[PDB]
Design a protein around this ligand. Structure first.
Ligand code: MLD
Ligand code: DWZ
Length: 349
């Protein structure tokens, strides 16, 4: 008689739904295989052309009891078998979100970012549920920025032309304290040209290199000694054609000495802390000579629009020789300031 094997055991509980359920027959073929819930609704499944193996084709649900019926037929006759199991019952669910967006072309400094809408109690599980593929292949590693967002990057800036595939396979995974993934998330992106801009406080020149060659110099005026621009490696973020900056947000009333409601053009964000490269017509005389800002890299209106036009998310701004300290590794765009050994060793525990 034929032999039936399944990837689940009869009477099992807490069966995780991160995996398909499969049925195999030896010494015969599968005539039929059905799987239903406790309202007798069938789960989508597929039987191989050779009749040897069947598998479910759609996500199983949480809190469900499934009944599997299978019948195989061979030379020695027929065999019919049945089992029931129950799936995980989460305490909570969390949903993941991943940047950069799918399809995007990004700069050589862009990390893979996966953000959850709940605190992750088992970072180790989360990391293992995330599969990142790279071509040309390159070693990278996970580091957590806070309790909800993990980052991934190589030791050195990405090589242009690298395809990155990210499969966040969290559905059915116990992420700790009864917390399970709400769904999977998939994304794909590509690394473009190496663009690295360097602001040297010694010279007050912001020089932009594309694949190693200067294509632009910009006189700049960085943060004054009271509020200096931090040295470090910054990752380019969002850009805006026009933006305001209110001191009303952060407590300071606009009708106060240090208050400021300021219309700003051509702003390219390079740190979560609020450092921008932007249009500063009112500082043009100081640019290339004196620092005058609150930290932002002030450039001329046409130098700011050039930057907004030719610089992309993930490109790099390196700041050097100023009187500030270093940008925090965990700023949000400060990832490269954490030494590799510390980054690679991670903080999953
Ligand atoms: N060893 C690896 C084992 O588990 C593996 C697993 O498979 C193992 C070997 C396994 O658990 N095999 C089970 C499936 C097995 O040998 N048999 C049962 C055979 C039937 C049975 O035990 N009882 C029947 C027949 C006996 C009748 C009698 N119990 C009765 O009460 O009437 C029954 O309950 N029948 C009646 C009609 C009913 O309930 O209505 C089945 O598929 O139903 C692998 N196979 C896959 C993915 O396909 C996979 O890799 C690691 C793991 O998952 O550990
Ligand atoms: C660029 O100069 C823009 C930003 N304005 C700033 C400001 O005047 O405060 C700074 S950020 C500043 C640093 N910490 C403060 C804060 O919110 N915390 C205490 C955490 C705000 C920034 C470069 C433009 C608005 O001036």
């Amino acid at each position: 008689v034929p032999k039936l094997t399944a990837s689940v055991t009869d009477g099992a509980v807490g069966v995780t739904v991160d995996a398909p359920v499969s049925v195999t027959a030896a010494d015969g073929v599968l005539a039929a295989v059905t799987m239903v819930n406790d309202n007798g609704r069938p789960v989508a499944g597929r039987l191989s052309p050779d009749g040897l193996r069947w598998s479910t084709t759609e996500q199983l649900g949480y809190n469900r009891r499934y009944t599997l019926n299978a019948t195989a037929l061979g030379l020695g006759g027929a065999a019919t078998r049945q089992l029931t199991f129950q799936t995980s019952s989460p305490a909570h669910l969390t949903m993941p979100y991943v940047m950069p967006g799918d399809g995007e072309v990004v700069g050589v400094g862009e990390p893979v970012a996966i953000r959850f809408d709940e605190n992750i109690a088992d970072r180790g599980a989360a990391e293992k549920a995330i599969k990142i593929t790279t071509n040309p292949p390159v070693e990278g590693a996970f580091y957590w920025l806070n309790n909800r967002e993990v980052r991934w990057r190589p030791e050195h800036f990405w090589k242009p032309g690298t395809a990155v595939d990210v499969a966040v396979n969290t559905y059915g995974v116990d992420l700790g304290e009864g917390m399970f993934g709400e769904d999977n998330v998939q994304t794909h992106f590509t690394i473009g040209d190496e663009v690295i801009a360097t602001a040297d406080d010694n010279t007050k020149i912001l020089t932009v290199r594309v694949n190693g060659e200067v294509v632009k110099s910009m006189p700049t005026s960085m943060g004054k000694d009271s509020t200096p621009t931090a040295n470090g490696i910054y990752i380019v973020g969002s850009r805006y054609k026009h933006i305001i900056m209110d001191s009303s947000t952060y407590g300071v009333p606009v009708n106060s000495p240090n208050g400021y409601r300021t219309d700003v053009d051509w702003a390219t964000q390079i740190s979560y802390s609020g450092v921008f490269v932007h249009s500063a017509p009112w500082s043009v005389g100081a640019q290339g000579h004196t620092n005058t800002s609150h930290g932002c890299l002030n450039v001329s209106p046409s130098n700011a629009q050039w930057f907004y036009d030719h610089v992309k998310r993930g490109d790099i701004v390196e700041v050097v020789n100023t009187v500030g300290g270093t940008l925090p590794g965990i700023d949000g765009l400060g990832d490269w300031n954490i030494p590799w050994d510390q980054w690679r060793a991670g903080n999953a525990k």
